[PDB]
């Protein structure tokens, strides 16, 4: 936490560098929170950006409705 | 006879900066004998660490709960047309590298040895994304996205729905849609100017940050206390006095430091409880009058509430409540009922009013005269039991159809 | 485990201190143990009061939910259940309460075309409680929570003003049930 490991699987974050977990570009559901928007999970252990949710862009129109 | 659109700001803190402290580092630091002597006191350090981790994860939990009220990230349509309404101030600016609206930029600019500050799990960028998604959901779906799947709806249709929910007919909307949009834009500009001109508008988060900084400064400065010893430093006492009294002096110093740390922990605990209560209030406001229409009076806005736009704030949340305020009242003569042909007529939803010589039915929030007929009134008994009735004829809508 | 601490003394048992140390300094050692355990008890009491305040707030919220959406109907959105709340069933729990919420969730949306009003005979017709929808050829009125198309009728619509001031209106006729009644 707040300690750089360059003067002591390395991924440097805002909180600090993570040792033992590899960074993955793909984002999934968070299981173990860490901080600074990056959290790790077990699938081996990997680190990835937190996923807010599925993207859904509703088609807004001036004269359209979706009645249930 | 008239109405105005007013916007108000309500600020509620949701979280503070997370703090992590090490007991053995804060009390003495790099002394091996102090570390050995601290092990016989029990599990005070473990209890303090557990309490700090618990309040930190509670802060993270309520910060996630107050913002991530939906699991779908909505995006604004590329066409920024909503029937003449303007929302450029609340919608994020694509030109900004942080994808933040100029309002959020103004709020961000207006806010300025063992202990350390842990960065929050929910930082600025996805909080801004969550606020943008909530704005898109409340501008394209109304309350339908907060109660299930998102349903597309025109903005004037949502305005008519909210007006009917608050008790206003849809006649006055389309007749003055341009006037309503102009009033809303003028109110938005005026409240933006007031927010930019008044430095005390965001005072709640300012005093929260000031209190946290003052508590940290007091905790730091309490280390320079003699606490009955010759000096606040421990190596001089260790290397100067004999160990039989040096042990007692170090014991007194470390127990004073432990008492100060316990006082700071208790203050942090009660401040976290207050912040949790404020975050619960903010979450109730979020659930009530953001993703839907709230029938409560003066709960999250003065006057007849219509909607609110949540805005991202540093260590807090700021709501832009838009309310309905009547204006330009006029004097009229009212009657409890109307006696016609020996029968009492009562309005279904209006009120019998008179301008001096003619009687009309009007809404309880706006003035709209109409002829008293059988569709908007019901008959229940005769017209002598009630006190204060007047005499007025009732026109039959269906009579001229068969009169010819 | 706090009873096993020594607080800078030589033993964790007061009997050993009394039977092994001279009383002029044994009194001071016993006083130090007493004040250390008093500080520990004060910390425990403060933690208990903080936890009791938090649990009291939680129980006040639970009693508010009990009063609001168990004994009656609450119009609050997502207060005690996601979506349109209907009712909830309280169940006993050890040192707690469990709510069995029942909610109304719409599904299976369908695309349709709407108009703000209907201009008939130079007058604007507005729905009293429904909303005008179109499937492509004809216009129908239905509630905002379900798809129940119906013929446009003056019973469920009110006329107020003309259609020359509204924006985006369409042209359609309005069925009057009195006309076939007087036709025969
Ligand atoms: C209700 O109030 C609004 C303003 O609060 C009035 O709108 C003004 O109308 C005059 C002339 O009609 C214009 O010169 C002003 O520029 C308008 N102001 C705004 C802010 O648009 C409106 O006329 C009032 N209506 C009634 C019936 O009194
Ligand atoms: C909505 O409001 C924004 C500003 O609040 C308007 O943007 C202004 O447009 C004028 C003329 O195009 C410029 O002179 C100003 O500099 C703009 N303001 C800013 C802050 O850039 C905008 O025109 C309004 N209308 C719409 C449809 O967006
Ligand atoms: C009260 O309101 C009624 C309704 O507008 C007024 O009746 C109209 O008055 C105007 C002139 O003032 C006439 O041209 C209309 O023919 C009247 N309508 C009907 C149906 O008769 C009435 O004058 C108002 N009274 C006062 C004292 O202001
Ligand atoms: C409204 O009309 C009723 C019925 O025409 C009036 O009641 C009569 O009032 C007169 C004197 O005002 C009495 O002599 C009758 O006996 C009353 N008849 C009944 C059936 O009560 C009533 O006075 C009228 N109200 C006003 C304000 O003029
Ligand atoms: C829109 O709905 C109307 C009414 O439900 C449909 O009109 C009917 O369509 C069926 C199917 O062929 C015919 O058998 C009926 O005779 C029609 N009724 C009338 C009064 O015309 C219409 O077809 C629907 N349009 C679409 C595109 O689905
Ligand atoms: C609905 O019908 C009315 C008349 O039945 C249309 O109004 C006419 O519009 C044309 C061209 O816009 C004008 O030349 C006429 O003078 C208008 N007549 C009247 C009496 O206003 C109206 O345009 C129609 N609307 C739609 C959307 O079709
Ligand atoms: C650690 O130091 C290296 C170089 O000394 C630097 O590139 C890196 O950004 C530092 N880590 C952090 C988190 O700043
Ligand atoms: C929707 O219709 C209105 C007028 O009815 C028009 O001003 C607006 O540009 C239209 N929007 C789109 C996206 O076509
Ligand atoms: C209505 O009349 C009362 C007294 O007759 C007066 O005090 C009041 O100001 C009037 N209301 C308006 C809007 O003028
Ligand atoms: C209103 O009160 C006054 C005095 O109390 C009384 O003379 C008058 O008749 C009352 N009017 C009505 C409509 O009750
Ligand atoms: C309605 O149409 C839009 C685009 O025309 C589409 O994205 C959407 O999926 C449609 N909704 C349904 C329920 O088919």
Curated annotation (Swiss-Prot), chain B:
It comes from the Viruses. Disulfide bonds join 23-45, 28-34, 289-300, 339-383. The record marks 100-101 as: Cleavage. Residues 206-250 form a coiled coil. Changing residue 116 to N: In strain: Lambda/C.37. Glycans are attached at residues 2, 86, 331, 355, 391. Changing residue 328 to H: In strain: Kappa/B.1.617.1. Changing residue 375 to H: In strain: Alpha/B.1.1.7. Precursor of the fusion protein processed in the biosynthesis of the S protein and the formation of virus particle. Mediates fusion of the virion and cellular membranes by functioning as a class I viral fusion protein. Contains two viral fusion peptides that are unmasked after cleavage. The S2/S2' cleavage occurs during virus entry at the cell membrane by host TMPRSS2 or during endocytosis by host CSTL. This is Spike protein S2.
Swiss-Prot record, chain C:
Residues 1-30 form a coiled coil. Changing residue 138 to Y: In strain: Theta/P.3. Changing residue 129 to K: In strain: Theta/P.3. Disulfide bonds join 69-80, 119-163. Glycans are attached at residues 111, 135, 171. It comes from the Viruses. Subunit of the fusion protein that is processed upon entry into the host cell. Mediates fusion of the virion and cellular membranes by functioning as a class I viral fusion protein. Contains a viral fusion peptide that is unmasked after S2 cleavage. This cleavage can occur at the cell membrane by host TMPRSS2 or during endocytosis by host CSTL. In either case, this triggers an extensive and irreversible conformational change that leads to fusion of the viral envelope with the cellular cytoplasmic membrane, releasing viral genomic RNA into the host cell cytoplasm. This is Spike protein S2'. It comes from Severe acute respiratory syndrome coronavirus 2 (2019-nCoV). The gene is S. The chain holds residues 964 to 1147 of 1273 of the full protein.
């Amino acid at each position: 936490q707040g300690v750089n490991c360059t003067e002591v699987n390395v991924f440097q974050t805002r909180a600090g560098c993570l040792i033992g977990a590899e960074y993955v570009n793909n984002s999934y559901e968070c299981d173990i929170p860490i901080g600074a928007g990056i959290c790790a999970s077990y699938q081996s252990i990997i680190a990835y950006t937190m996923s807010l949710g599925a993207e859904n862009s509703v088609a807004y129109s001036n004269n359209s409705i979706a009645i249930p | 006879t008239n109405f105005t659109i007013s916007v108000t700001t309500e600020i509620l803190p949701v979280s503070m900066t997370k703090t992590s402290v090490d007991c053995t580092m804060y009390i003495c630091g790099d002394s091996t004998e102090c570390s050995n002597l601290l092990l016989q006191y029990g599990s005070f350090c473990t209890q303090l660490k557990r309490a700090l981790t618990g309040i930190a994860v509670e802060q993270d939990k309520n910060t996630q709960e107050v913002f991530a009220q939906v699991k779908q990230i909505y995006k604004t349509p590329p066409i920024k047309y909503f029937g003449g309404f303007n929302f450029s101030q609340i919608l994020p600016d694509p030109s900004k590298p942080s994808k933040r609206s100029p309002i959020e930029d103004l709020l961000f600019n207006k806010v300025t040895k063992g202990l350390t500050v842990l960065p929050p799990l929910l930082t600025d960028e996805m909080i801004a994304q969550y606020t943008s998604a909530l704005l898109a959901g409340t501008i394209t779906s109304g309350w339908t996205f907060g109660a299930g799947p998102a349903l597309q709806i025109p903005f004037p249709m949502q305005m008519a729905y909210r007006f009917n929910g608050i008790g206003v007919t849809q006649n006055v909307l389309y007749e003055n849609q341009k006037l309503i949009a102009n009033q809303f834009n003028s109110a938005i500009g005026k409240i933006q100017d007031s927010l930019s001109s008044t430095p005390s508008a965001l005072g709640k988060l300012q005093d929260v940050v000031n209190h946290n900084a003052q508590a940290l400064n007091t905790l730091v400065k309490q280390l320079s206390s003699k606490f009955g010893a010759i000096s606040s430093v421990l190596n001089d006492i260790f290397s100067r006095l004999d160990p039989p009294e040096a042990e007692v002096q170090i014991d007194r110093l470390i127990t004073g430091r432990l008492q100060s740390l316990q006082t700071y922990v208790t203050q942090q605990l009660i401040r976290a409880a207050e912040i949790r209560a404020s975050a619960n209030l903010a979450a109730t406001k979020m659930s009530e009058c953001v993703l839907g229409q709230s029938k409560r009076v003066d709960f999250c806005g003065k006057g007849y509430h219509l909607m609110s736009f949540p805005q991202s704030a540093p260590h807090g949340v700021v709501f832009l409540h838009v309310t309905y305020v009547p204006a330009q009242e006029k004097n009229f003569t009212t009657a409890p009922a109307i006696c016609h042909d020996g029968k009492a007529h009562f309005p279904r939803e209006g009120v019998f009013v008179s301008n001096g010589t003619h009687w009309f039915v009007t809404q309880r929030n706006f003035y709209e005269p109409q002829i008293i007929t059988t569709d908007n009134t019901f008959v229940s008994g005769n017209c002598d039991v009630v006190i204060g009735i007047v005499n007025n004829t009732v026109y039959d809508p269906l009579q001229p159809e068969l009169d010819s």
